[PDB]
Amino acid sequence: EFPEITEEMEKEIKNVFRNGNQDEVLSEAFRLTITRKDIQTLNHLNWLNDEIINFYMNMLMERSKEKGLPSVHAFNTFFFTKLKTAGYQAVKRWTKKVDVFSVDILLVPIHLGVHWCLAVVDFRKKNITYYDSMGGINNEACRILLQYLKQESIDKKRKEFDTNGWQLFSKKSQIPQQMNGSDCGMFACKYADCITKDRPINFTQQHMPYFRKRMVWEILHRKLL
């Protein structure tokens, strides 16, 4: 059971996959821009680009904040890769005006080569979790995030981070797995959608053509269905 894309909605979708002004701004929000060219990476089995992922992640963050949902901060795609390669100093900056400790969930999209995955800090559950639709385990990435939270706590609030009961880990194939390499960004987005709603991750690989069509639609209306 999944909201339907009416006729109607497909017409809006088909229309934007058409050839035309590549610079045409289809959606503008969150400091970001979605063009015709960004939207096209959602087409067929194209690899998503960062603008789509970031834009989507910001929609989840915007949706958090409505009543009853856990509150969410989404880090932008470059954050982790700038953190892994350069350390805390190079990213400490990125969280001015943001108290990363006042939300329930932190979303961290992880770019490893051609591949996408996701880490999630859930402060309610006191744990840090890695999701890969290929089934890769990434121990390291969780530790790197823990270590970042530490240095952020010392820096933003003058206190050490309290690791008691905190659990760092990767989901094995307890999550639906990809078949199409190019769907990795879509699994990362959809993992985050369920998680930020506290809903079980119920879909599989077969829903991916539908999810691509839907995200085009959602992005264009800035409405999550």
Curated annotation (Swiss-Prot):
A motif (Nuclear export signal) lies at residues 216-225. Changing residue 115 to A: Abolishes SUMO2 processing and SUMO2 deconjugating activities. Changing residue 78 to A: Impairs SUMO2 processing activity. No effect on SUMO2 deconjugating activity. The active site is at residues 115, 132, 184. Highly expressed in testis. Expressed at lower levels in thymus, pancreas, spleen, liver, ovary and small intestine. Its main location: nucleus. Changing residue 111 to A: Impairs SUMO2 processing activity. No effect on SUMO2 deconjugating activity. GO terms for molecular function: deSUMOylase activity; endopeptidase activity; SUMO-specific endopeptidase activity. Changing residue 132 to A: Abolishes SUMO2 processing and SUMO2 deconjugating activities. Changing residue 184 to S: Exclusively nuclear. Loss of CCAR2 desumoylation. GO terms for biological process: negative regulation of proteasomal ubiquitin-dependent protein catabolic process; positive regulation of transcription by RNA polymerase II; proteasome-mediated ubiquitin-dependent protein catabolic process; protein desumoylation; protein sumoylation; regulation of definitive erythrocyte differentiation; regulation of mRNA stability; regulation of postsynapse assembly. GO terms for cellular component: focal adhesion; glutamatergic synapse; nuclear membrane; nucleoplasm; nucleus; postsynaptic cytosol; presynaptic cytosol. Keywords: Cytoplasm, Hydrolase, Nucleus, Phosphoprotein, Protease, Thiol protease, Ubl conjugation pathway. Residues 32-194 are annotated as: Protease. It is found in: Nucleus; Cytoplasm. A motif (Nuclear localization signal) lies at residues 156-159, 209-215. Protease that catalyzes two essential functions in the SUMO pathway. The first is the hydrolysis of an alpha-linked peptide bond at the C-terminal end of the small ubiquitin-like modifier (SUMO) propeptides, SUMO1, SUMO2 and SUMO3 leading to the mature form of the proteins. The second is the deconjugation of SUMO1, SUMO2 and SUMO3 from targeted proteins, by cleaving an epsilon-linked peptide bond between the C-terminal glycine of the mature SUMO and the lysine epsilon-amino group of the target protein. Deconjugates SUMO1 from HIPK2. Interacts with RBM33; promoting ALKBH5 desumoylation and subsequent activation. Belongs to the peptidase C48 family. This is Sentrin-specific protease 1. It comes from Homo sapiens. The chain holds residues 419 to 644 of 644 of the full protein.
